[PDB]
Design goal:
monomer; 168 residues; Rossmann fold; seven-stranded mixed β-sheet; 7 strands; globular; binds guanosine-5'-diphosphate; binds magnesium ion; transport protein; diras2
Length: 168
């Protein structure tokens, strides 16, 4: 019916911004906290058309049940951190663990956002690449602000899907 992608990460890393750049083409400098939003986009699925549903989650820890349900229903996951915050990278570890616990063949992308702020970088790409290796997932850096690697993010994620032929 649909192909479901969920986006996780700490508050302020750019989850909403990556999703909005991809789906709507827009960017805002203002921070607007999210509870849980979803967006649909028409994509190709096998020799037919379906929707991609993207779930933009919260970085609040106050909704653990909601977060577990979002993991359960997702087909593919994007784990976002900010290259300017080592703490935001560390905060993805428990999320990765919950995906493994609940899912027990799953596209997963580790994404270092805000790569336009390389001068204030705290997480070197080499370190995030090492983590992605241990997690056996893909890695890339993005900038929602610059529209750097935003289309590529979703293209690469759907290309990792081998249980279904999904593309943009
Ligand atoms: N410099 C820069 N700022 C960004 C980027 N992506 C998001 N932001 C900003 O970071 C703040 C949090 O973005 P938001 O999308 O709401 O993050 P979320 O809390 O993870 O959903 C906002 O002020 C955005 O303008 C980016 O790629 N570069
Ligand atoms: Mg948000």
């Amino acid at each position: 019916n649909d192909y479901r992608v969920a986006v996780f990460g700490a508050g302020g890393v750019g989850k909403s911004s990556l999703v909005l750049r991809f789906v709507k083409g827009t960017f805002r400098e203002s921070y607007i906290p999210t509870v849980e939003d979803t967006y649909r986009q028409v994509i190709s699925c096998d020799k037919s058309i379906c929707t991609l549903q993207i779930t933009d989650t919260t970085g609040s820890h106050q909704f653990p049940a909601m977060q577990r349900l979002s993991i359960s229903k997702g087909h593919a996951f994007i784990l976002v951190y900010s290259i300017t915050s080592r703490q935001s990278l560390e905060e993805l570890k428990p999320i990765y663990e919950q995906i493994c616990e609940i899912k027990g063949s799953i596209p997963i992308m580790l994404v270092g956002n805000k790569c336009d702020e390389s001068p204030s970088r705290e997480v070197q790409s080499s370190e995030a690449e090492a983590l992605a290796r241990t997690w056996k997932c893909a890695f890339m850096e993005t900038s929602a602000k610059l529209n750097h690697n935003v289309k590529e993010l979703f293209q690469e994620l759907l290309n990792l899907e081998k249980r279904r032929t999904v593309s943009l």
